[PDB]
Write an enzyme that holds these catalytic residues in place. Structure first.
Site, PDB file in Angstrom:
ATOM      1  CG  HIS A 234      -1.733   1.144   1.402  1.00 21.49           C
ATOM      2  ND1 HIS A 234      -2.895   1.427   0.596  1.00 21.49           N
ATOM      3  CD2 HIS A 234      -1.821   2.329   2.163  1.00 21.49           C
ATOM      4  CE1 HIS A 234      -3.400   2.438   0.884  1.00 21.49           C
ATOM      5  NE2 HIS A 234      -2.722   3.147   2.119  1.00 21.49           N
TER       6      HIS A 234
ATOM      7  N   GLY B 184      -3.544   5.205   9.408  1.00 21.40           N
ATOM      8  CA  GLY B 184      -1.833   5.276   9.438  1.00 21.40           C
ATOM      9  C   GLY B 184      -1.550   3.827  10.371  1.00 21.40           C
TER      10      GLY B 184
ATOM     11  CB  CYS C 262      -1.272   0.405   6.823  1.00 18.13           C
ATOM     12  SG  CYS C 262      -2.615   0.776   6.103  1.00 18.13           S
TER      13      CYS C 262
HETATM   14  O1  LIG Z   1      -1.587  -1.217   4.626  1.00 16.52           O
HETATM   15  C1  LIG Z   1      -2.513  -0.259   4.454  1.00 16.52           C
HETATM   16  C2  LIG Z   1      -3.572  -0.202   3.750  1.00 16.52           C
HETATM   17  C3  LIG Z   1      -3.763  -1.002   2.661  1.00 16.52           C
HETATM   18  C4  LIG Z   1      -5.137  -0.634   2.193  1.00 16.52           C
HETATM   19  C5  LIG Z   1      -5.696  -1.252   0.940  1.00 16.52           C
HETATM   20  C6  LIG Z   1      -7.257  -0.613   0.742  1.00 16.52           C
HETATM   21  C7  LIG Z   1      -7.382   0.363   1.558  1.00 16.52           C
HETATM   22  C8  LIG Z   1      -6.703   0.902   2.376  1.00 16.52           C
HETATM   23  C9  LIG Z   1      -5.548   0.367   2.761  1.00 16.52           C
HETATM   24  N1  LIG Z   1      -4.560   0.710   3.839  1.00 16.52           N
END
Ligand SMILES: O=Cc1cc2ccccc2[nH]1
Ligand SMILES: O=Cc1cc2ccccc2[nH]1
EC number: 3.4.19.12
Lengths: 302, 302
Positions: free
Chosen positions: A41, A143, A145
């Site tokens: 991402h 944030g 992720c």
């Molecule tokens: O890791 C963060 C992350 C992956 C993702 C996929 C779709 C929408 C938002 C997203 N955030």
């Protein structure tokens, strides 16, 4: 005595969290040996979110486009590759705090601890379970992720989960540390339904055993039941079927309490059919299904 | 979204846990700079447990009688003293992992994270609150003496609790890091009743605000109430009185949701008088009182 939803000590994982920025997107990364793992991402922008072309996005990136920061220390990226839904950023410095570690893929019903991180900084730690529909009911903000889930087995960290997205229903989906999603989910901003979730039966039974061990005995009735009869009732209340593998894993708890597994099933059967009548078990008015038989033994008898 | 009972990352505290043995008794210790802190229970035996003569027991101890082990490393004790209910063991080696730290004494209603340790080894971490009767509803087994509670404020560890004993009722009592017990408790094996516990009202209100933020709105009614009228109902259901200090601290949550504090009190008033009718709030069928207004802001908006 007492009983809490305990998480593993997070120090071994805290020493591996870094901040990964590529272009304008920033998220968390896992720094083990000389490799940083993070969701792909990080190479996306807003425009491409409906269906990102990840290969084309990565082809246009150089090593220098990746800014990796461990605390206030910038790590130099000397190579990169994509494996499924995660990126591997090879850096010139090995993490001196790398614990003994494994990458594992867990099954539904198993539990793990989550280290919630933001900008590479750990914020908090909590315990959760992989639901039968392959989602987790976590607590993440924007944030988060790249936050990882893990178990600790006597100085060996088993990484099992990396966080990616939040579904419109408020539950969360992620991948293993090799980039494969748990469940039928893709890292795109499209509506994706999770399957109908069910209750983890063997975990409820283990939690009832923990109640007996800590002194809550009011729900134990005088009856027994067969495995087939129990599974018929469990089906009506959206509980997973109980297998002989589950009966086997509950053995040690049965031996400690003297309560045969099928006798505890008879007690759960009455609880499902009649309710608690406003009473609580281990401080809860609901049946808890986020404690494995292994979790119960660890907390009730180290 | 989502909402969990999150604990602070424990790495800064894990690097300070040591094992303290004096004679035949072993427990946990806190190693900060060149001083190890531990309960004075370590110089006791079974015989003296009904009313230990701690001064006489310590007079007969030399520095060499204290075995302190940090992992597999033996620390040499070069001095000792007793302050209230804890011992200070001066060692020849300063802990290289000492974080920035403070010793604080918390008030009832405040929360902190507990690092459960055994033989100097962290076992798990969980979040709990100091009850109005100065006990905590933790999870400890035998050998957990010396486990510490703490809060983390941007790299500064505020130690607030050291674990000593478990009451016959199954709740737990301990001291601050200067050796003074929370509540009317003494480190002797005599029956000691905790006062009647109450519910932390301001924490329930903060938890209801977290519910609104995460989408659970079914309990919000169309009424308001005065502060005096609310406290009359709260008294009947064993809730703490709500003060203007508590109304002030709930300000930011009120501004975020648009719900005046006295309006949320009117909604809690109906919940207390009529119940939930089998419904849940943030996944719980009971009213939770272990989230401070500060805890809610941190998890709902970093
Ligand atoms: O890791 C963060 C992350 C992956 C993702 C996929 C779709 C929408 C938002 C997203 N955030
Ligand atoms: O710290 C351990 C500890 C203190 C204490 C006091 C009475 C009974 C048991 C106890 N354990």
């Amino acid at each position: 005595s007492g009983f809490r939803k305990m998480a593993f000590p997070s120090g071994k994982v805290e020493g591996c969290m870094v901040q990964v920025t590529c272009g304008t997107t920033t998220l968390n990364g896992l720094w083990l040996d000389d490799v940083v793992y993070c969701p792909r991402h990080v190479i996306c922008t807003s425009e491409d979110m409906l269906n990102p072309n990840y290969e084309d996005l990565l082809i246009r990136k150089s090593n220098h486009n990746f800014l990796v920061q461990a605390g206030n220390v910038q790590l130099r990226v000397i190579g990169h590759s994509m494996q499924n839904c995660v990126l591997k950023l090879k850096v010139d410095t090995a993490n001196p705090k790398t614990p003994k570690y494994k990458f594992v893929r867990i099954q539904p019903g198993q539990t793990f601890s989550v280290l919630a991180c933001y900008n590479g900084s750990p914020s908090g730690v909590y315990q959760c379970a992989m639901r039968p529909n392959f989602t987790i009911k976590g607590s993440f903000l924007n944030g988060s992720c790249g936050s990882v889930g893990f178990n600790i087995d006597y100085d060996c960290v088993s990484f099992c989960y990396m966080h990616h997205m939040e579904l419109p229903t408020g539950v969360h989906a992620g991948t293993d540390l090799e980039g494969n999603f748990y469940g039928p989910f893709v890292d795109r901003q499209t509506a994706q339904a999770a399957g109908t979730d069910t209750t983890i039966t063997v975990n409820v039974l283990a939690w009832l055993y923990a109640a007996v061990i800590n002194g809550d005995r009011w729900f134990l009735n005088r009856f027994t039941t067969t495995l087939n009869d129990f599974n018929l009732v469990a089906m009506k209340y959206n509980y997973e079927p109980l297998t002989q593998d589950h009966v086997d894993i509950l053995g040690p708890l049965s031996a400690q309490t003297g309560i045969a597994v099928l006798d505890m099933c008879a007690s759960l059967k009455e609880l499902l059919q009649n309710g608690m009548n406003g009473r609580t078990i281990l401080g809860s008015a609901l049946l808890e299904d986020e404690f494995t038989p292994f979790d119960v033994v660890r907390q009730c008898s180290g």
